[PDB]
DNA sequence: ACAGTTTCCCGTAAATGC
DNA sequence: TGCATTTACGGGAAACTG
């Protein structure tokens, strides 16, 4: 916070200095008109008077000037601190945000600074048109509030210019209401909400500021790119700031059916085989125009690149784009980026994984089972420093597959998601383990041996536990695992409820098993007693061998 | 056939007539430029001639005069017939094939009538047009080519009007291609096809008329009805008429991409409260227009009242009403019919249900069926002539439920069309039969007591079997049936393989049931030996007690 | 105080682009 | 001769608008 609260010195002295010169104006003026008095008089009254008058105003003009010089000087070095360093460190934190890493801090601190820098320019260029009425009132050969007189006028459009731009952001990024998770990937049709949000606050600048919605602004991957598909934006293109909007004190613009639709055309033909899948990159810039008497500035500002497809079938893989663009890029971005995909360092990939995981539940990945995953990306010698190409990655087929590592964690996702949540987050589910150490970890003989794998089969996403009762024979019983569950299987019936029951061709009347020992002892029922789904004759779904 | 066959000589009568006129009128022209021939010589080779002339010619205009107004009858006598009976009767066959009734009939034998009768006419214009071109050359004080002259004309745009006009059919009604079995209800949004045609088929007429299909025309039910609301046809409102679209040689045109939006206003503000749910019937209508020199007509035709809706939820409901107009109505058609919903006799709607049956499946209702069902509309003295009201069909709530009787049918359709079609259709499923009657038959002591029967209480359609083994004391063991199964358990597992492993707590270690006798023995297996399903630990889910 | 109705969506069965 | 994208909607439930 140090760094913080020290800008925060440098906006208050901004502050004090712009007061502290406006009132030494009022006593320029002021003081002015009594010499101007005292001076006809003298005059009439005839038909150190002199030295005062042409003397001190002098020495209180440019004592003035200097002040004023000074302040915007400040005013600069606090500026740079606010736009260079907070605002790209919030935003650099933005990214961040949006593939599942910590929460984005409240921009209400930011708010704060830029508009309080933002009334000390609007005072400056105030005390600057006082300052020209005392020059048409009175003038002289070197009277620095002339020469001075237009550098510093100028000098406060620049500063306060690029202050406002600046200020113009994407407080919430684009997003489908029905993927708060998943942000940054629109899908036609569909109508998207994004948020913007001006950090200068200025009352006599609500309702004035029209924001317009344009899509792929100045994206050369158009014509560079082959096969590059074209879309408009849709609902509605424009929506006016308020501060009514949003509870929180503060001038925004929500926009909601905001919504894409290709420009289906020969222009671009499809090529279906050009430069890139359809995750290529897309932006939606936002642009606006402060129109005011003397004063005309243009406020434009971008989201973060976008993947837009037709099909929810489309977004598993979209995502995997979004991932791998924010988990490395920060800098004005490149929406070729795809066109050479740098590789990723696992020691980051394996944080973003775990991310995923403590985005769609409650608990993320633990280190045994990101090693488990590790050591099926890069293999024996997985190493936090080793690299991971994007094609290793969302397109090559994995350990002996039909389907990429990524489309595989994306369908266990969303496995957990609609179907195991209350087993996954209480712990329940180890699902990431190497089949070794699956059966290296069992002669825990105590028989009721359990285990619930996911398995590294399925496109689908499927979930397995493993057997181990004893061998009759002085060897531990071949180590028994049932075929996957998919989301089938699972809709008709809970997992603990196949759980409890799975009885096995079990030769009874009363009970039958192998279940009873969860992971080391917790007993079955002890175990998974939350999770069971506890005139005709009652029935009940069952798996059996 | 009979009536057909005899229709068929009164148009090839028709034929035989214009053919015969026209071969007189060329015998009327030459022989007068004959006489006129040998009027002019006589009289320059000067500066029984006299009787010929002016006597035969004349006879001979009278006599084909005469004849034309002879043809002209006849057609209308067959024309009468074509339009009023002959297609009156192929439109009231279209109504009944859509609610799942016999095929209707190929248009050819139709339209081989129409366009011979629509030649004649076309004939008898030109030898209309030669008359006068005599008359011009020669007249006089009773020439009959001069009286009768206007009269004939007139009256043969009458009979060709009429004829074309009544032409113009809707060859096939509107339709979701989506719900082949289900024409008259379409949802907006998706697009619906249509077909249209002319039965006259004439040359100079292909890629002239231009048809425009319109909504709820002259639809009065749009002031006169509350609430009721207004669509717009949206796609290609317009498709110009070809015979290269029908293979068969044949005029005709067919719209698909046709979709319907709501006109959503203030004018027509919702009451949802208004005179009728909103299964109120709206209308296709056709328009186009013969435009020729000399000649011009306008055609128009509708489609039988449709249906509106906006989600397929709907639908079962908007079905309901179809069968109920079409079931009892033919006549210029009521669009406020459910103002005032006609009950239903049942000989007539017991038939119907069972078409329902044989229109998504292969077999219809028969008796038995048909008699629990109806017991259950009229109760104990249920009978043919009994009265069925549109209520106690589509609102009230039946039996001692939660849902009204039409939709508990369509809900077993609709469950045995997506999972019970084999088995329904090899009669293996009694589904409706009265709880009692299913006891009754029941004491067939081959302990393999096997009866799927219908469940009468769920919203949704399951199927449940009965139980019936041994009392241990002297009484048939209590009659025995599980709960139903709905598409739930029955998607996650075929209703055959849950048969096979009904198992229900069965102390053992190889066999075990209550299974194995279908109805009277048909031996389980051998009864269901076509429908069941036949490192990991291979499964199969299975209902149990 | 919802209760019929429509809108929005998702993921599938199929169509379709080059 | 194909798949890589896209369109169609049946279907479960939220959002309408009164």
Redesign the interface.
């Known amino acids: 916070l140090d760094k913080q609260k020290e800008l925060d010195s440098k906006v208050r002295n901004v502050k004090d200095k712009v007061m502290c010169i406006e009132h030494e104006i009022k006593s320029l003026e002021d003081l002015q008109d009594e010499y101007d008095f005292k001076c006809k008089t003298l005059q009439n009254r005839e038909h150190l008077l002199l030295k005062k008058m042409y003397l001190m105003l002098d020495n209180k003009r440019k004592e003035v000037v200097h002040k004023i010089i000074e302040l915007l000087n400040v005013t600069e070095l606090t500026q740079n601190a606010l736009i260079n360093d907070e605002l790209v460190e919030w935003k650099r934190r933005q990214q961040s945000a949006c593939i599942g890493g910590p929460p984005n801090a409240c921009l209400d601190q930011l708010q704060n600074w830029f508009t309080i820098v933002a009334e000390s320019l609007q005072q400056v260029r105030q005390q600057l048109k006082k300052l020209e009425e005392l020059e048409q009132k009175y003038t002289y050969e070197h009277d620095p509030i002339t020469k001075n007189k237009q550098v510093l006028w100028d000098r406060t459009f620049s500063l306060f210019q690029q202050l406002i731009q600046s200020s113009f952001v994407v407080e919430r990024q684009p997003c489908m209401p029905t993927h708060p998770q998943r942000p940054l990937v629109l899908k036609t049709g569909v109508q998207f909400t994004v948020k913007l949000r001006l950090l200068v606050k200025l009352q006599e600048l609500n309702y004035n500021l029209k924001v317009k919605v344009l899509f792929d602004k100045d994206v050369n991957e158009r014509n560079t790119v082959k096969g590059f598909r074209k879309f408009n934006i849709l609902g509605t293109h424009t929506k006016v700031m308020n501060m009514e909007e949003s509870t929180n004190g503060s001038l925004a613009a929500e926009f909601r059916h905001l919504q894409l639709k290709e420009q289906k055309n020969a222009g671009t033909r499809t090529n279906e085989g050009p430069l890139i899948v359809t995750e290529e990159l897309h932006s939606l810039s936002f642009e606006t125009q402060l129109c005011q008497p003397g004063l005309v500035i243009d406020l434009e500002t971008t989201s973060l690149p976008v993947v837009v497809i037709s099909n929810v079938s489309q977004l598993p893989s979209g995502w995997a784009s979004i991932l791998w663009y924010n988990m490395l890029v920060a800098e004005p971005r490149n929406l070729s980026f795809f066109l050479t995909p740098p590789c990723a360092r696992w020691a980051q990939l394996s944080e973003v994984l775990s991310w995923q995981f403590s985005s769609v539940t409650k608990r993320g990945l633990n280190v045994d089972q990101l090693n488990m995953l590790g050591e099926k990306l890069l293999g024996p010698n997985a190493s936090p420093d080793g690299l991971i190409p994007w094609t290793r990655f969302c397109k090559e087929n994995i350990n002996d597959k039909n389907f990429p590592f990524w489309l595989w964690i994306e369908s266990i996702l969303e496995l957990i998601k609609k179907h195991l949540l209350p087993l996954w987050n209480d712990g329940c589910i180890m699902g990431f383990i190497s089949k070794e150490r699956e059966r290296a970890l069992l002669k825990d003989q105590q028989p009721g041996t359990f285990l619930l794998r996911f398995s590294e089969s399925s496109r689908e996403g499927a979930i ?1 536990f493993t ?1 181990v009762e004893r061998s009759q024979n002085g060897g531990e019983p071949d180590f ?5 569950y998919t989301k ?2 699972l ?3 809970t997992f603990p409820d196949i759980i409890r ?1 799975y009885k ?2 079990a ?3 009363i009970p039958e098993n192998p279940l009873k020992y969860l992971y080391p002892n917790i007993d079955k029922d002890h175990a998974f007693g939350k999770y069971y789904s506890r005139g ?10």
């Open positions: 397995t057997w028994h695992a049932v075929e996957p089938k299987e809709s008709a019936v029951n096995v061709m030769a009874e009347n005709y004759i009652k029935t009940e779904l069952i798996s059996v061998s």
